[PDB]
Enzyme design. Structure first.
Site, mmCIF file in Angstrom:
data_model
loop_
_atom_site.group_PDB
_atom_site.id
_atom_site.type_symbol
_atom_site.label_atom_id
_atom_site.label_comp_id
_atom_site.label_asym_id
_atom_site.label_seq_id
_atom_site.Cartn_x
_atom_site.Cartn_y
_atom_site.Cartn_z
ATOM 1 N N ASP A 167 0.808 -1.216 0.000
ATOM 2 C CA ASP A 167 0.000 0.000 0.000
ATOM 3 C C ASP A 167 0.840 1.265 0.000
ATOM 4 O O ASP A 167 0.566 2.231 0.714
ATOM 5 C CB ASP A 167 -0.999 -0.060 1.149
ATOM 6 N N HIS B 60 0.963 3.449 -2.288
ATOM 7 C CA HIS B 60 0.020 4.529 -2.612
ATOM 8 C C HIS B 60 0.658 5.886 -2.973
ATOM 9 O O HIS B 60 0.334 6.917 -2.371
ATOM 10 C CB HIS B 60 -1.015 4.676 -1.460
ATOM 11 N N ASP C 179 -0.914 -2.034 -4.663
ATOM 12 C CA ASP C 179 -1.514 -0.718 -4.387
ATOM 13 C C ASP C 179 -0.419 0.353 -4.330
ATOM 14 O O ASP C 179 -0.254 1.077 -3.355
ATOM 15 C CB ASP C 179 -2.413 -0.704 -3.141
ATOM 16 N N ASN D 280 -6.103 -3.723 -5.853
ATOM 17 C CA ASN D 280 -7.317 -3.152 -6.469
ATOM 18 C C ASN D 280 -7.061 -1.725 -7.034
ATOM 19 O O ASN D 280 -7.622 -1.377 -8.086
ATOM 20 C CB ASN D 280 -8.507 -3.169 -5.496
ATOM 21 N N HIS D 281 -6.150 -0.950 -6.397
ATOM 22 C CA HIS D 281 -5.830 0.401 -6.903
ATOM 23 C C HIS D 281 -5.041 0.427 -8.201
ATOM 24 O O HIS D 281 -4.947 1.478 -8.830
ATOM 25 C CB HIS D 281 -5.316 1.374 -5.828
ATOM 26 N N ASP E 228 -7.483 1.583 -10.829
ATOM 27 C CA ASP E 228 -8.017 2.953 -10.763
ATOM 28 C C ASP E 228 -7.812 3.600 -12.121
ATOM 29 O O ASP E 228 -8.451 4.581 -12.447
ATOM 30 C CB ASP E 228 -7.272 3.790 -9.693
ATOM 31 N N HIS F 115 -3.154 -9.058 -1.987
ATOM 32 C CA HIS F 115 -3.800 -7.792 -1.750
ATOM 33 C C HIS F 115 -5.251 -8.138 -1.442
ATOM 34 O O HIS F 115 -6.136 -7.992 -2.296
ATOM 35 C CB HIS F 115 -3.684 -6.937 -2.999
ATOM 36 N N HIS G 152 -3.704 -4.355 1.253
ATOM 37 C CA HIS G 152 -5.115 -3.965 1.169
ATOM 38 C C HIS G 152 -5.692 -3.361 2.459
ATOM 39 O O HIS G 152 -6.084 -2.192 2.443
ATOM 40 C CB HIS G 152 -5.992 -5.120 0.614
ATOM 41 N N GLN H 107 -4.258 -2.293 5.055
ATOM 42 C CA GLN H 107 -3.353 -1.208 5.493
ATOM 43 C C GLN H 107 -3.119 -1.232 6.999
ATOM 44 O O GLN H 107 -3.477 -0.304 7.733
ATOM 45 C CB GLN H 107 -3.791 0.174 4.949
ATOM 46 N N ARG I 123 -10.097 17.323 10.803
ATOM 47 C CA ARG I 123 -10.503 16.091 11.493
ATOM 48 C C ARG I 123 -11.375 16.346 12.725
ATOM 49 O O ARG I 123 -12.414 15.693 12.878
ATOM 50 C CB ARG I 123 -9.277 15.226 11.852
ATOM 51 N N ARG J 120 -15.488 14.871 11.837
ATOM 52 C CA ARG J 120 -15.859 13.673 12.590
ATOM 53 C C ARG J 120 -16.701 14.022 13.814
ATOM 54 O O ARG J 120 -16.936 13.155 14.649
ATOM 55 C CB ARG J 120 -14.594 12.889 13.002
ATOM 56 N N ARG K 107 -10.447 14.489 3.840
ATOM 57 C CA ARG K 107 -9.044 14.437 4.269
ATOM 58 C C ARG K 107 -8.283 15.732 4.460
ATOM 59 O O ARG K 107 -7.132 15.715 4.930
ATOM 60 C CB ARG K 107 -8.262 13.410 3.431
HETATM 61 ZN ZN LIG Z 1 -6.571 -2.227 -1.472
HETATM 62 ZN ZN LIG Z 2 -4.990 0.070 -0.216
#
Ligand SMILES: [Zn+2]
Ligand SMILES: [Zn+2]
Ligand SMILES: CC1(C)C=C(CSS(C)(=O)=O)C(C)(C)N1O
Length: 525
Positions: A16, A18, A59, A91-92, A95, A192, A227, A229, A350, A354, A385
């Protein structure tokens, strides 16, 4: 291999990533420091007469604006320099169109693996199921597996003639194939799929624990995860540590004779599993998560703050800096785009999103309703975020608010379903990522019941059809939200959250923040 000889094998791993090719704003992580750390491990292990295998849980895509607008090219080229041996497709990696992933396979000098992804019309795999490695005189097979939630999670346009078969059933077939043909000494699965305590996946597709349990005992030396994380560090049997501290020992999970590991995310750690092989037996000697220049935020009583390294500084490899710097500058030049403007701050902090309804919640949901033709909308406060300051809005600002590559969905439902759905969502408490941000909804929540419930200022008519917009995440059960993906009125648009927000800002600019100002439409007690 040699009879009775004990071999040393170190498996290094990350997941991940990312888009985190560069160090963050506090000087943490980045591939330059990862390269120095990995180079040093390779040297130490080689001097002991051992072997190194470096694996990724996938990812690599999505998460940093500089990386996103370059389709993770600096990340893949950086990974070649760190010296990655194989990667599972995440999965990313979907994207982007499949052609972009093909170009990532061209940039990567290591295979991007997945055994369970098939072309429906031909019954053929889209990717290589496994890769083979020779380490000393040992034959090591690495299998790649991708979560079968991928098509359900992403853009449907990309999966018309593509199916994600159950990874655990695919792993059984691939293991059997390898045992019968290549006969590797060691089999590792790079996955993943995610790690769930005691295999309690919830609304997610079954992950690593469930797969390890379904496979023949010890058939895999290890499952290199991703996945979910999470740093896979056990507090007790079938229970991962909550709030794992960098630099502390990390006990990985073992299920049915198979070790399950994960190195959290963003190149924050390099997982290190030292094994000894002898006569087919694989024994784990040591496991650790090595922090990559992670820093603790320290706040003094006068309110002054500083970030301090947990462990000694890892120098940034200069060859990595020379490779990555031109992409970091190109990434910045691509981000230098004004997409619109706002006459005021859009609250995305944040401690606000929230806890209470914010104008950023209203803006995002207005963008989602406008794209889908929705009557009302909801999202987790945890999906917001960042904030957008008053003035010019850049594409970077938008990407920081919506960095995860979530997809916009809608569901046509009856007023009765609207009443039941909003009643369950209103139970989500403040001080949680699950806290709901609403648009076009008004009510007084009292004793788990909604009073004076209205959509667009009108009482809910049970017979009437209402369209709600949300993200794929919430629609599929994310944050414990009621499932919408199995309802007949559900439509996954395939549109990315950040693109929808960007285009809406563009056509609505200059934004008048007063229009997005919450006025106590929704309240509790
Ligand atoms: Zn993932
Ligand atoms: Zn991920
Ligand atoms: C996945 C893809 C191509 C779509 C986007 C907008 S939504 C970003 C820029 C996040 N991206 O990298």
């Amino acid at each position: 291999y040699e009879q009775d000889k004990t071999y040393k094998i170190t498996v290094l791993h990350t997941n991940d990533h990312h888009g985190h090719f560069w160090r963050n704003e506090y000087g943490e992580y980045g591939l330059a420091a990862q390269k120095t750390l990995v180079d040093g491990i390779r040297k130490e292990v080689a001097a002991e007469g051992g072997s190194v295998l470096l694996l990724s849980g996938g990812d690599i895509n999505t998460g940093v604006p500089e990386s996103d607008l370059q389709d993770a090219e600096p990340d893949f080229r950086g990974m070649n320099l760190v010296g990655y041996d194989a990667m599972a497709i995440g999965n990313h990696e979907f994207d982007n169109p499949l052609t972009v992933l093909r170009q990532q396979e061209k940039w990567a000098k290591f295979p991007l693996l997945s055994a369970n992804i098939y072309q429906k019309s031909t019954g053929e795999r889209l990717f290589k199921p496994w890769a083979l490695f020779k380490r000393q005189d040992l034959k090591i097979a690495v299998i790649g597996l991708t979560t079968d939630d991928t098509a359900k999670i992403g853009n449907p346009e990309y999966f018309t003639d593509i199916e994600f078969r159950k990874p655990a059933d695919e792993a059984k077939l691939v293991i059997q194939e390898l045992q019968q043909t290549e006969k590797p000494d060691i089999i590792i699965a790079a996955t993943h799929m995610g790690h769930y305590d005691n295999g309690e996946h919830g609304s997610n597709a079954p992950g690593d624990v469930e797969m390890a349990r379904a496979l023949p005992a010890g058939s895999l030396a290890m499952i290199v995860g991703g996945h979910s994380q999470d740093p896979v560090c056990m507090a007790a049997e079938n229970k991962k540590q909550v709030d794992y501290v960098p630099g502390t020992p990390c006990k990985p999970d073992q299920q049915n004779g198979i070790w399950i590991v994960q190195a959290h995310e963003w190149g924050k750690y390099v997982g290190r599993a030292d094994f000894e092989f002898r006569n087919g037996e694989m024994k784990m000697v040591n496991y650790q998560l090595i922090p990559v220049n992670l820093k603790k935020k320290v706040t003094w009583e006068d309110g002054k703050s500083e970030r301090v390294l947990y462990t000694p500084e890892i120098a940034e490899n200069q060859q990595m800096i020379s490779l990555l710097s031109p992409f970091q500058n190109k990434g910045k030049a691509q981000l230098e785009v004004k997409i619109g403007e706002t006459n005021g701050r859009l609250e995305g902090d944040r401690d606000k999103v929230r806890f209470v309804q914010t104008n950023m919640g209203r803006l995002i949901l207005a963008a989602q309703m406008d794209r889908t033709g929705a009557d009302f909308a909801v999202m987790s406060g945890g999906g917001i975020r960042d904030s957008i300051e008053a003035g010019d809005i850049s594409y970077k600002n938008v990407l920081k608010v919506q960095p995860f590559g979530n997809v916009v969905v809608y569901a046509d439902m009856t007023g009765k379903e609207v009443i039941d759905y909003l009643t369950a969502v209103a139970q989500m408490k403040p001080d949680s990522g699950a806290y709901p941000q609403f648009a076009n909804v008004s009510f007084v929540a009292k004793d788990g019941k909604l009073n004076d419930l209205k959509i667009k200022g009108e009482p809910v008519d049970p017979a009437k059809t209402y369209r709600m917009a949300t993200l794929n995440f919430n629609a599929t059960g994310g944050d414990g939200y009621p499932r919408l993906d199995n309802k007949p009125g559900y439509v996954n648009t395939g549109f990315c959250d950040a693109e929808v927000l960007k285009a809406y800002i563009q056509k609505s600019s200059p934004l008048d923040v007063s229009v997005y100002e919450p006025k106590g439409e929704v309240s509790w007690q």
